[PDB]
């Protein structure tokens, strides 16, 4: 309820860090690391962002691939509650990641002049 | 709470369509806060090290931090579920964290 005073998507940075970060303040709420492919082109597609959720690395970790060059990883859920259904939680997490990827493209789109 | 440790200690944030900025502190005490600036904020490096104040503001009273350099932190959301044993030393640690965040912002934007 206090989270609702915040914007839905917060884009983050840190000193000395090449990777970026994100906070999602609506359900499901989380902190995540933003990392990038080397051919990220940034052009805004007519089609909506449709990314993939997967397990990656060692040991296996949840990660999101936007397929437009942005990745989301090191998820930390900020909700204490556990979701009743695992399938619907993963779906909600993925949709949130898609919105974030779209919002990130607009951060770049706003800026390039 | 151990996953927090793979992150950098201080994360500076922004949102589209928003004038205010944001911060995440990922070491104890962990929190999300709103970062804002008054009209006398210069972003210039201070003569003394950052020495801010923690206080209660509004009615009802809510915690807020004033860097006294024009930078404010507010709308604190604690990210740790544990409750502190001594309330005095928690505030001291929280205020100290805020001082580091303000200083860090100054160095990032310098």
């Amino acid at each position: 309820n206090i989270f609702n005073k915040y914007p839905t998507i917060i884009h983050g940075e840190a000193r000395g860090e090449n990777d970026e970060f994100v906070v999602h303040t609506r359900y499901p709420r989380f902190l995540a690391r933003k990392s990038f492919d080397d051919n990220f082109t940034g052009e805004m597609p007519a089609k909506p962002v449709n990314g993939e959720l997967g397990q990656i690395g060692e040991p296996r970790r949840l990660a999101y691939d936007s397929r437009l060059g942005l990745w989301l990883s090191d998820f930390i859920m900020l909700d204490n509650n556990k979701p009743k259904n695992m399938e619907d939680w993963l779906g909600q997490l993925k949709a949130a990641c898609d919105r974030i990827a779209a919002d990130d493209l607009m951060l770049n789109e706003d800026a390039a002049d | 709470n151990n996953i927090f440790n793979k992150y950098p200690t201080i994360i500076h944030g922004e949102a589209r369509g928003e004038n205010d900025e944001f911060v995440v502190h990922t070491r104890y005490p962990r929190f999300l806060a709103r970062k804002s600036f008054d009209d006398n904020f210069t972003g210039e490096m201070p003569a003394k090290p950052v020495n801010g104040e923690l206080g209660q503001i509004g009615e009802p009273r809510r915690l807020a931090y004033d860097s006294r350099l024009g930078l404010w932190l507010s709308d604190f959301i604690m990210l740790d579920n544990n409750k502190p044993k001594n309330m005095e030393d928690w505030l001291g640690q929280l205020k100290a964290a805020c001082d580091r965040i303000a200083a860090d912002d100054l160095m990032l934007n310098e």
């Binding site: 940075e13 706003d110 800026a111 | 205010d20 709103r34 008054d38 009209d39 904020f41 404010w72």
Partner: peptide, 30 residues
């Protein structure tokens, strides 16, 4: 009370954030 950031300070800070972000993303590219 807690201040709300003014438009003039926010526009200058937003531009500097954009310049840093463009520089940071170029290291990932190619």
């Amino acid at each position: 009370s807690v201040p709300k950031t003014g438009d003039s300070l926010a526009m200058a800070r937003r531009l500097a954030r954009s310049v840093r972000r463009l520089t940071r993303r170029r290291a990932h590219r190619l």
